[PDB]
Each structure stands twice: as structure tokens, then as C-alpha cells.
Amino acid sequence: LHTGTKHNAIISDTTTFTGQSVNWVLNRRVKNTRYTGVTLKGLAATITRQ
Amino acid sequence: MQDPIIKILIGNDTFLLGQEIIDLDFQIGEGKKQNNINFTIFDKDGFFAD
């Protein structure tokens, strides 16, 4: 997933693109929540479905 | 001997090897390391940069 770009305008025409894995999507926003009575697979499933 | 082919699809355009691609990086991480890409293209007049 594209996340950043760089470009040198003066003479040298160079544009640098940067992309990251989808885990970057899971690390974007800080959350406050609570989980009770859920297995690791269930918690991961809910988080991925989000 | 190396006979590379590199094709990058971004947005709605493609960069092929020998057309504008200057350099390309990689990462395939497991734990602390994620997967990322950093690739540089020749952007005459910065059009793609725009």
C-alpha cells in the first residue's frame, strides 16, 4: 500500500515511491477497548474483520 | 546470469524495466520486520510526482 512519496525537481528528475504491508493499516490508530471470554483466534478474527 | 523483469502497477499506470525504473528495494519480514517497498523512477517534468 502506497504510503509516501519523494521528488527532486531541480534537474535530476527523480520520484521515489514507498509502500508498506497491510499491517501498517492495523497500526494507524490508537484504540481503547476491552475483550472478555475470547480466544486468540477469535480476537484476531474480529480485529481482521474490522 | 541475470535476466530480470520488473513490473510495478500503481494507481492506474505501470512502470516496466528499461522504461523509467531507476532503482527498486524490497523487504520480506517475519517478526519485528514488516514488508515494504521503496522504488525510484525517472519523472520527466515530475509528471508522475504531480
Binding site: 504510503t3 514507498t18 508498506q20 504491508s21 499491517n23 501498517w24 497500526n27 | 523487504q27 519480514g29 519485528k32 520486520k33 514488516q34 515494504n36 521503496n38
Partner: peptide
């Protein structure tokens, strides 16, 4: 000398930005 000091600084910066995107 200063040219290369700057080059080295920029190398380090891009290696640190690399590390930012290298780690999850």
C-alpha cells in the same frame, strides 16, 4: 568534507527512514 558530511547525514536520515518502514 562538508559536502560529504552532509551526504553522510542524508544517508543516515534515509537509513533511519528506512528503519522506520523496515520495522512493524
Amino acid at each position: 568534507p562538508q559536502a560529504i558530511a552532509k551526504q553522510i547525514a542524508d544517508i543516515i536520515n534515509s537509513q533511519w527512514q528506512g528503519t522506520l518502514t523496515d520495522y512493524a
